[PDB]
Amino acid sequence: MPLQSLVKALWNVLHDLTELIAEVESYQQRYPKQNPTNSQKIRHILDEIYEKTPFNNTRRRILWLAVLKTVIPLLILDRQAVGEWWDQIFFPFLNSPTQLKPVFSDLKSILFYILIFHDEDEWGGDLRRECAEETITRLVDLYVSKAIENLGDSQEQRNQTIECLVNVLVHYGIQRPKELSSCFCHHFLNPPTRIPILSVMVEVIRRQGPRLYEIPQTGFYDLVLKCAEFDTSPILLSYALSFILMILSHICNSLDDSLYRLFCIYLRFSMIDPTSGFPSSTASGNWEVFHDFMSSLDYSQLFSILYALYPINFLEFLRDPKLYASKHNFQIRYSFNQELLSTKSDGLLGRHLAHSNFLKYTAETELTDKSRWTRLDSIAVVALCNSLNAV
Amino acid sequence: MMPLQSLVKALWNVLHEPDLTELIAEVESYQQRYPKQNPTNSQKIRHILDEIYEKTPFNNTRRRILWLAVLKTVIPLLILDRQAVGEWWDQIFFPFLNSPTQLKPVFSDLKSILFYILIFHDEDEWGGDLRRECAEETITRLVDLYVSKAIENLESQEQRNQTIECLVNVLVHYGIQRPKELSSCFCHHFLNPPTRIPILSVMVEVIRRQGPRLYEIPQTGFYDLVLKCAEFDTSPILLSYALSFILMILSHICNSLDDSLYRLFCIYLRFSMIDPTSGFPSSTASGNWEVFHDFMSTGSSQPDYLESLDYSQLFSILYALYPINFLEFLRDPKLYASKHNFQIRYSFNQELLSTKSDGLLGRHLAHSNFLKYTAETELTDKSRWTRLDSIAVVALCNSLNAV
């Protein structure tokens, strides 16, 4: 009789957790791995008290969260069950959040138990992942739709929900960047999603956690470029660049394919006008452009990096990009002032030293000769020890 | 229109009477008549040179000057085989290098020839593997003369010195173009202890240029030897030659590092316990190495810039890259060595190693590896070298910035 005394204490405390906590620890000693028939039982017993006292007023909320927080490690869930947990706890909370920081810390405490886990085979089968999968998708989906929907009659109350959802999604991201980028992928294709998603994405990349290298696998990166190539809104595009810049050190491999794209992007951004703003694209694929009114990471950095790495082709692209475009089989979608290009670009170039590449490689060998990325192992290891010297 | 016959006259003229110009013009009319090499004609032509060499051989200087001047002009045309350079070696190259004509432009001409053999674009330029065969040969005899010549004890030195000087120059200039090759030729010789000092002598100089493509040297197995030399040999000079070589090549490996890591820790131990009176520690083991000591009875002149390559850098380079295991090793190395299943060969002074290596640690920032890995995850976990791709890019852009 160690279950039948914990359940006493549920009831006792869903009308100090001292007694509940105590009984949980003597439960975990007798059951260290999760027990499914005790999970089942206890799952049921909660369903029954939630009938008796629900999530309506805040003091019932505080309570329920403290409790769910301390008992959830003992349980085993699935897609069906988190649907219940979402429907009846997560959504209600987010949808109109209590103004107590602890109470939200607790909400997070529970969410992140489901989302982030060492062991995948912990609850049997795939279940631990499946739960996290759903939970992250519902969270994503709520934020996206909460970020667009016209807002009928509380504004401030709506800013409270995105303040919390962001904080949670960012937090998921720095730990799980392939996953959060996968969740954003269908949504990204729908214009008004874009400002919000990026707003969240840069905030993850700004931290430079691992393992951002994963992100391109998920096809998001590809999208983020399409946004920089085609979309219009100056606010959006500035997010898009800060993104593609900040991730560009954590690749060099996808660099081979996104090169010609990136050149064209440098072209677009260098050409940003006071009055006309950006040059609008023409081709656009089937991308369905974003315009502003439906009705300090500037291109300078992008230059440096393209002028390292691909200097010969870069300075051949600039000079005559329409030209460089045929011969490499692509199109310059944007109308653009050359002499202004040669001007700005040169100002920047004056600030750089001269490139050895010009002595070793041609423009043909610069694109094709992977022996060149030998020299990288060499100069990294040297620059690593120079970071560990204090003086 | 007759082509070859007029050139032989041109040739015969120019070896009895030092004006060339005529010959030069006869070579330019033939070359359009035969852009590729013609093996029926090389045949005839060497037949000719052979003839004229018994008539007017090498012997005095002035003859040499002329011989050289002329071979240089003609050698584009000819085709040699493994056996043919055995002529030129015995009849021309060897005569020269043993007692050399003290005339820079002469040696210049000689080198013109050699490196015309030694260095080339197309492997089938002569048919089959002949171009590369002569090459492989020449360098061999060069190497074998350089080694022989730098051990044979006694030609009033001043003669001998001019010999090795020339050879070195030539080997180094081969080295920097073809490191993979030259380090190949050096392995056997290197197993014989007195070749070491002279062989590292050349190799460190090649490495120092940091020309391409030093990564190729490990494949030869020469990297592994040099390490052996550092683990076992006694000779202060040879040793520092050794450490120099390995420090300046480590930056082009980071792959064999996963195979050399413990070796290197043992080396770091050993080079760090260097003593005024007892010098290096003695290698208890050796295996089948064949130790070299200084007085193997009972060059020299070690390059002054290679001095700054002391164990301090080995420390700095093992503190980055393998911070955890390195520091572990330097706490109880015997202990670390069981468990990682190798052996400490040296007697050493613990407290000294901790007094001294502390001194060096203190110069260094705290390592992040301590927050992200354990000792075993540090050793195995190939994702750690992903971060390196990103820091490499940022390291690059800030050198190309003029301020």
- The CA distance from B276 to B287, in Å, is 27
Q: Which residues of B touch A390 (CB under 8 A)?
A: 363-365
Q: Which residues contact B318 (CB under 8 A, 6 or more apart)?
A: B264, B265, B268, B326
DSSP secondary structure, A353-373, as one string: ---THHHH--HHHHHS-GGGG
- The CA distance from B76 to B31, in Å, is 9
Work out whether the CA dihedral A110, A112, A117, A121 comes out positive or negative.
Answer: positive
Map chain B to HEC letters. Answer: CCCHHHHHHHHHHCCCCCCCHHHHHHHHHHHHHCCCCCHHHHHHHHHHHHHHHHHCCCCCHHHHHHHHHHHHHHCCCCCCCHHHHHHHHHHHHHHHHHCCCCCHHHHHHHHHHHHHHHCCCCCCCCCCCHHHHHHHHHHHHHHHHHHHHCCCCCCCCHHHHHHHHHHHHHHHHHHHHCHHHHHHHHHHHHCCHHHHHHHHHHHHHHHHCCCCCHHHHHHHCHHHHHHHHHHHCCCHHHHHHHHHHHHHHHCCCCCCHHHHHHHHHHHHHHHHCCECCCECCCCCCCCCCCCCCCCCCCCCCCCHHHHHCCHHHHHHHHHCCCHHHHHHHCCCHHHHHCCCCCCCCCCCCHHHHHHHHHHHHCCECCCCHHHHCCHHHHHCCHHHHCHHHHHHHHHHHCCCECC
Could you count the other beta carbons within 10 Å of the beta carbon of residue A67?
19
Of A210, A376, A388, the CB nearest to B392: A376
- The CA distance from B132 to B123, in Å, is 6
- The CA distance from A75 to A38, in Å, is 8
- Choosing among B180, B258, B387, which should be mutated to test the A contact, i.e. which has the most A CBs within 10 A? B387
Torsion angle of alpha carbons A54, A55, A58, A59, nearest 10°?
A: 40
- The CA distance from A124 to A36, in Å, is 10
Cross-strand bridge partners of residue A277: A273
Q: Which residues of B touch A252 (CB under 8 A)?
A: 389, 393
Give the closest residue to A372 by CA, choosing from A382, A362, A381. A362
Distance, C-alpha A164 to centroid of its chain: 15
Cα-atom radius of gyration of chain A, to the nearest Å? Answer: 27
Cβ contact, residue pair A380, B399, below 8 Å? no
Cβ contact, residue pair B252, A377, below 8 Å? yes
- Structure tokens given for A354: 């001269």
CA distance A159 to chain B (A): 37
Give the closest residue to A308 by CA, choosing from A250, A238, A366. A366
- Choosing among B254, B389, B394, which should be mutated to test the A contact, i.e. which has the most A CBs within 10 A? B389
Report CA-CA distances (Å) from A41 to A35, A47, A113, A368, B144. 10, 10, 21, 64, 86
- For chain B, the residue count is 403
- The CA distance from A352 to B401, in Å, is 5
- The CA distance from B111 to B363, in Å, is 48
Cβ contact, residue pair B391, A378, below 8 Å? no
Report CA-CA distances (Å) from A286 to A181, A230, A282, B383. 21, 11, 11, 37
Residue with token string 């072209």: A267
Cβ contact, residue pair B393, A305, below 8 Å? yes
Angle at A277 (CA atoms; ends A272, A278), nearest 5 degrees: 60
b/e code B258-288 from CB counts within 10 Å (16+ = b)? eebbbbbbbbbbbbbbeeeeeebbbbeeeee
Cross-strand bridge partners of residue B279: B275
Of B252, B365, B390, the CB nearest to A249: B390
Residue type at position A105: S
- The CA distance from A266 to A262, in Å, is 6
Nearest-Cα residue of chain A relative to residue B216: A374
Q: Which residues of B touch A371 (CB under 8 A)?
A: 213
- Structure tokens given for A291: 């315009």
Could you count the other beta carbons within 10 Å of the beta carbon of residue A93?
21
The CA-to-CA distance between both ends of chain A, in Å, stands at 65
- Choosing among A302, A353, A388, which should be mutated to test the B contact, i.e. which has the most B CBs within 10 A? A388
Q: Which secondary structure element, helix H or strand E, spans residue A300, and what is its range?
A: helix A299-307
Query: A284 in the Ramachandran plot: left (φ > 0), alpha (ψ -120 to 50) or beta?
Result: left
Q: Which residues of A touch B319 (CB under 8 A)?
A: 385, 388
Instruction: Note whether A210 and A174 are within 8 A (CB).
Output: no
- The CA distance from B403 to A351, in Å, is 7
- The CA distance from B157 to B300, in Å, is 14
Distance, C-alpha A231 to centroid of its chain: 20
Cross-strand bridge partners of residue B401: A352
CA distance B73 to chain A (A): 30
- The CA distance from A346 to A122, in Å, is 59
Q: Which residues contact A52 (CB under 8 A, 6 or more apart)?
A: A14
- Structure tokens given for A334: 């944007």
Distance, C-alpha A88 to centroid of its chain: 27
Contacts by residues B328-334 (CB-CB < 8 Å, ≥ 24 positions apart): B328/B375, B329/B265, B329/B269, B330/B269, B330/B354, B330/B357, B333/B265, B333/B266, B333/B269
Cβ contact, residue pair A304, B401, below 8 Å? yes
Cβ contact, residue pair A249, B393, below 8 Å? yes
Work out whether the CA dihedral B324, A388, A375, A298 comes out positive or negative.
Answer: positive
Q: Which residues of A touch B364 (CB under 8 A)?
A: 388-390
Q: With H, G, I as helix, E, B as strand and everything else as coil, classify residue A160.
A: helix
Instruction: Note whether B399 and A351 are within 8 A (CB).
Output: no
Give the closest residue to A110 by CA, choosing from A80, A70, A58. A70
CA distance B260 to chain A (A): 16
Cβ contact, residue pair A355, B386, below 8 Å? no
- The CA distance from A186 to B32, in Å, is 68
Instruction: Note whether B285 and B186 are within 8 A (CB).
Output: no
Work out whether the CA dihedral B236, B250, A383, B396 comes out positive or negative.
Answer: positive
b/e code B319-351 from CB counts within 10 Å (16+ = b)? bbbbbbbbbbbbeebeebbeeeeeebbbeeeee
Angle at B63 (CA atoms; ends B57, B68), nearest 5 degrees: 95
Of B316, B387, B396, the CB nearest to A308: B396
Cβ contact, residue pair A308, B383, below 8 Å? no
Cross-strand bridge partners of residue A389: B364
CA distance B317 to chain A (A): 7
Report CA-CA distances (Å) from B270 to A9, A174, B193, B308, B333. 66, 44, 20, 18, 11
Nearest-Cα residue of chain A relative to residue B211: A375
Of A353, A376, A385, the CB nearest to B402: A353
Cβ contact, residue pair A307, B386, below 8 Å? no
- The CA distance from A124 to B282, in Å, is 59
Q: Which residues of A touch B321 (CB under 8 A)?
A: 381, 384
Instruction: Note whether A200 and A173 are within 8 A (CB).
Output: yes
Q: With H, G, I as helix, E, B as strand and everything else as coil, classify residue A389.
A: strand
Nearest-Cα residue of chain A relative to residue B319: A385
Q: Which residues of A touch B402 (CB under 8 A)?
A: 350-353
- The CA distance from B180 to A303, in Å, is 37
How many contacts, defined by CB atoms under 8 Å, are there between A and B? 97
- The CA distance from B58 to B68, in Å, is 10
- The CA distance from B206 to B173, in Å, is 8
% helix, strand, coil for chain A, step of 5:
70, 0, 30
- Structure tokens given for A166: 């962001």
Q: What are phi and psi of B252, to 5 degrees?
A: -115, 30
Give the closest residue to A62 by CA, choosing from A111, A13, A22. A13
Instruction: Note whether A266 and A230 are within 8 A (CB).
Output: no
Q: Which residues of B touch A361 (CB under 8 A)?
A: none
Cβ contact, residue pair B320, A210, below 8 Å? no
Q: Which residues of B touch A388 (CB under 8 A)?
A: 316, 319-320, 364-365, 367
Instruction: Note whether B127 and B38 are within 8 A (CB).
Output: no
Interface of B with A (CB under 8 A): 213, 215, 250-252, 254, 316-317, 319-321, 363-365, 367, 383, 386-397, 399-402
Which technique was used to obtain these atomic coordinates? X-ray
Q: Which residues of A touch B365 (CB under 8 A)?
A: 387-390
- Structure tokens given for A77: 């869930």
b/e code B234-251 from CB counts within 10 Å (16+ = b)? bbebbbbbbbbbbbbbbb
CA distance A199 to chain B (A): 23
